[PDB]
């Protein structure tokens, strides 16, 4: 019970916070990608009307 339990327990908690936080950032990037393709599409319609 040497408080190394206590010590790694938080570090266990941290890599857990860090790993979720990378899923968060990944999901943000994916939604940004979608937003990006809508703006591209949008721009390709404005081109394909300027003829």
């Amino acid at each position: 019970g040497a408080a190394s339990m206590t010590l790694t327990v938080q570090a266990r908690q941290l890599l857990s916070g860090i790993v979720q936080q990378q899923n968060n950032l990944l999901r943000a990037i994916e939604a940004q990608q979608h937003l990006l393709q809508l703006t591209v599409w949008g721009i390709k319609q404005l081109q394909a009307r300027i003829l």
Binding site: T6, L7, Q10, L14, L25, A28, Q32
Partner: protein, 58 residues
């Protein structure tokens, strides 16, 4: 072409709301992670003193 503009605006506003939520979730998870970490800098440094202190073998 009258009902396609709308769908673009629909999807525009939905992913924009989704990105906003995701950054919000990340801003709070980052707050949490820096606390968890501040608190580890301490636990380690703490025990890293009783150790060095009592005597330092090896």
């Amino acid at each position: 072409d009258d009902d396609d503009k709308m769908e673009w605006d629909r999807e525009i506003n939905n992913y924009t709301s989704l990105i906003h939520s995701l950054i919000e979730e990340s801003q709070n998870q980052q707050e949490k992670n820096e606390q968890e970490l501040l608190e580890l800098d301490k636990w380690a440094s703490l025990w890293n003193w009783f150790n060095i202190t009592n005597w330092l073998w090896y």
